[model samples]
Target chain A: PHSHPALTPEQKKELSDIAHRIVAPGKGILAASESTGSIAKRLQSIGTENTEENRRFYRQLLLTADDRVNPCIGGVILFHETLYQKADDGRPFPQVIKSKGGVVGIKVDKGVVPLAGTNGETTTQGLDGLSERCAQYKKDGADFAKWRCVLKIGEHTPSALAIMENANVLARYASICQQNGIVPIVEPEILPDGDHDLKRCQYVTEKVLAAVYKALSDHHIYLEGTLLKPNMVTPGHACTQKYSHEEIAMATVTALRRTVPPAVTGVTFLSGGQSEEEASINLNAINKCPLLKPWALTFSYGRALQASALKAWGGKKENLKAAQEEYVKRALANSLACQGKYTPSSNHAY
Target chain B: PHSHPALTPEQKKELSDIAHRIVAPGKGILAASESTGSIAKRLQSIGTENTEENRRFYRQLLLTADDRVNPCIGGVILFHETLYQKADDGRPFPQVIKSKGGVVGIKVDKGVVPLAGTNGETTTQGLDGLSERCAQYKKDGADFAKWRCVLKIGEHTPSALAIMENANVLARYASICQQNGIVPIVEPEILPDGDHDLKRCQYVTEKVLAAVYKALSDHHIYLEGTLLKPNMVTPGHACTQKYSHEEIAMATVTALRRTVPPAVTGVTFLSGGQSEEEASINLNAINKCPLLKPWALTFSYGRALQASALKAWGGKKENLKAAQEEYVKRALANSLACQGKYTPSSNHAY
Candidate 1:
């Protein structure tokens, strides 16, 4: 008697299909949806002015990677700006991606807002006109949306407010997206910014994910139509404890299996603060770990996917081919890694 | 290795003591902490001006109830203005409450703030200078604090974000209070504004309280040191379904037993919009219902405790005795209710 169905079966199928296609088997996402300010740091480091043209060029470089990446990249998430940008062939980025067998996703959340009475914690904001915006984005070729809410681990950090607020916002975002035929990638990224150990990271990850799924249920969100973009469970960046990739994989998989429902379409991990090599190696280990993961587990990375390519590009038109090569290499490595077929190495060509 | 205790043993003991004392046998709270603006509605309803002196007079009336209430009222929560206001005897209001063996509590949350991406949902504020404010309040005779975070039931109301955010803020407020030797009353009130039924209210209540306890655990909050001020699980104000007091009691108590740990000091329910008779009757039913209530189940009412008394006083000094008597009658009834000893009556001398 208390049941309130938030979605029809038809709407659920639309979102579920888009989510499944985004992480279909050995496929993952190319997260080029960095906010205007976030992308500035990457551009600045490459000595490129933070201009629309530069941003378009950098995004275009990855979006137009060789056909090898087509089978590897199942989806491409675009910032609002890039979602409207066009390829050199005069096709819209979404059209270009769709033509290459990938779904088009958008970054829907504005950013994080400081939670009052919290220890510097925040809840995400982009929900003000989200339903309307989602409808508009759907018309403009967005099949999915991404919203990232961050949580930090510390002695008293990620207070209950931060975890619950973030998870709730993510669920709300997902509900709105599914109503508009856009799959929502629920990203509750636990930051590796402290000195906490691997086990601590695993504990926080499990708890955060548990809250997220419970919220999803309470909101009557269709888990089959949604994706999760969680940070890989690992020790804090500044932690003194050392752990092997296998151990990190064990922790990450164990945490996900315990919390995320089997009905959810996929788990696309964020490459938060991990080096490009480290990210791929850990993802490979995650896939190879002897645990029963009920959902597709793959990568939804930004820096880890584009670091070497950005260095190769160096803001030079002459570097386009080299950059694409670098991008394709990482894409292929991740494709194999998501399938437990990649071998790690300390060596690489850029 | 990752465990970081939010409270020392001494801090835990201090908060636990204050919380237990506030809800001991035949005892509960007098929620007189209406903000200045809130009290304006009460004043306006009875043709009285919203003046500080009048407010003080009204509060003083409750604080100085007859000795029969001494064993009934375990705590009396006050707004900031009234906390320092003097009684007719020139003693501070806190002193007046303390002299009657009631713990002095302050309402700490500023109010609710909008969570940007939610469906007109909000999270509470007031943490900006909470630690410093708490230290001073403790020194100024406050042994406990109250922070109210509201959620509502509807088709898509009380969105997941609202529940998570509110629960998290409550935990954050509780953690800070313990550090200052103050017990925190965690109030997550689900508004009875929709046409939802009993089952819906019970379901939402269970989910909300479950999220709350999980958040408290994540924040390392000492449940033994905190109190929960939740709304009594009831059909929405406009719901068509009619329910028996026994049914309401069954729903409310069943929800709590499933979620609240016995380690928590007590459950002090908000009367929400229930009338004086209805609130007392329902509370009595809750207590008398045959169930193994591991923690004290009682009332922490504002309107239920003061509605008839406010009408009797009508802003006139000549009606002081009448108002005090009305207040005492309800206090005595609730005292009996908390002890599972209440007997309903159609007659009152006040």
Candidate 2:
């Protein structure tokens, strides 16, 4: 830091505090919230009709989970539409979580724009007016923001162009958010969309994370105020490799432990279409097998948390209690897993 | 070209033509126009007063140069304050240039943003509202746009963060302009501020240009419709060692010939605060160099033209004719240099 531009005293302390709090011992984030499309997919899997009211009920139950979950769920990120939805009594969804002492966040990327030479991969949008929007959301009781830039696994996955493009965009977004007093949850998600091996996934994740951090540093962004929501370093979802939870945990935590700065808020793992039980189990193993991760190792799950809730509710009034109970079960499992306190015998679904 | 999105046939051809025309054989751009501050700095060097009217008169003189010089003066970039300013008879600066057969361009960068970790170095801003600005400038009779992202040469002058940040910003600026039918002049200038050698400068320049072009591809920018405004590969201004014209040209052209795509419209070299004589002589040698540079290698000079003009004008209306004369002297000198038609024995005024 000697030759670098000197950080202001206030800036330094603010960033340091953020990094320390997010990566605190026995803690991480839970991404129980996912997007509407993903919620629809989860509902389909459970033989339920996907509808807006059903979606609202599903997320509302997860947000209303017991307060202990907040200790593990450092932040809750929601999609744009979901960010403003209300409970059955018309209370704001974010308000319910605030009452439970959770920082509410909104996903801000306007999906992806096509990368020219790649095989239909895309970069995130929503940056055009994002700064102002982040300021507004901050005033509306939101304390954090999330922007997802996706990379994939293939013969030519994660090209140099893709890495640089997405990394720089994510950093720029984070810088703008912090300027508006919003801690940006930076998620450069490398999708588990191929049959690549675990080593290949780890290698790609390492390289991508390296580029992302370098960019954030360059943009003068405060890493302490930024959260990293990245995919766990595992083999592709369709891979036949039968890796144990311990193996997956070693791979995942190793990647975070290597490149993530101690100043970064936390390294919240994305569930990446994993089943509810598998996601919790993997997260639990990750916490237990960690080789000294400086940042918090936690979760920011979406479909994995709500699949059962959405199915149980089916947009019906009478089943709301059942849906909420199922959500609490998944949330509690995650809360325990986040502390490395889950047992394999506790993997039963309600 | 086969894979472009959102391009009409005529617009595509026009963009391609603009790129080709600027870098046509034995031709490049002549940056006779300087912003008020840039002109003031040059004037200060020669002990002259700076004034808006004085600056406009100097540009008017350059725009009225002999038609034969147009081939060498591929385009003339204007400062915002000068764009709307006119000659004694009140014709717009752009209209005057169009009448004299040169593409009128505007410098669109609002200047630099400090990089977080770099030593007093910065990237360009004005990316905010840049697309709308470009569209309006197009309506204002500008054919091309210029954005200058500056880099300096220290041990880590062109840091990875600096390179990536500048490249992505330039690409985004270009892509948005192209969407609204404006050709972009992508200039990521590596400053000659330190004591680095010409070879070191070349290395950094090549690396930076490679990053810029790669980013352009990522943004799906049309290379055939964009011009590259790069710094000449020269040693730091204060370097004790003096480099010959041949060495400078060899270093400069080879760097561009390697990294800049043939699809690019032209390679217009910024003078980078070089003296008028130094700029012309160096450009002359660059065109005659042994390297096979595909794009038009020309001058996008500011101070090199305005220094002598301001000295002659002294910000007095009575001195307008003398200022214009000085302007034309440097303009014609550059005209000959850009076409590889200049002699080492050119006039002393340059």
Q: For all candidates, state DockQ relative to the true structure.
A: 0.04, 0.20
lDDT of 2 by residue, B1-350 (tens): 23425467787888887777666665556565456776677666656567665566666666765565565566778878778888778787788777766788888877775554566766677765666788888899888888888888887667777787788889878877787778999989888998888888889999999999988887778888888888999999878888789888888887887788888867788888789899999999988887676767787787777668767766565876777777667777887888788885711111
Reference contact recovery of candidate 1: 0.00
Per-residue CA lDDT of candidate 1, range A41-134, in tens?
A: 8888889999999999889999988799998999999999999999888999999899999999999887775554456777776665677899
The Cα RMSD in angstroms, rounded to one decimal, for candidate 2 relative to the true structure is: 7.6
**Candidate 1: how close is chain B to the reference, as a TM-score?**
0.97
**Candidate 1 residue pairs in clash (backbone atoms < 3 Å):** A117-B127, A127-B117, A160-B168, A161-B168, A168-B161
TM-score of chain A of each: 0.97, 0.88
lDDT digits (tens) for residues A1-350 of candidate 2: 23563356675565455445544555545464456676667777756677787677667767876665666555577777777788777889888867765667777776776554455666676665566798788787777777889999888667776788888888878876776667788999999988888888988999999999997876778777777889988889889887788888888877777788887767777888799999999989988983776666777777676667777876666887787677767777887887789876811100
Interface RMSD, in order shown: 8.0, 5.1
Error of 2 at A293 (Å): 6.2
Q: Clashes per prediction? A: 5, 7
Best by lDDT: 1
Q: lDDT for model 2, on a 0 to 1 scale? A: 0.76
